[PDB]
UniProtKB/Swiss-Prot annotation:
The chain holds residues 58 to 69 of 79 of the full protein. Ca(2+) 2 binds at residues 1, 3, 5, 7, 12. It comes from the Eukaryota. This is Protein S100-G.
Amino acid sequence: DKNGDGEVSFEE
């Protein structure tokens, strides 16, 4: 998240 996927892509 926040980057784990893409700038929080996950938590985005």
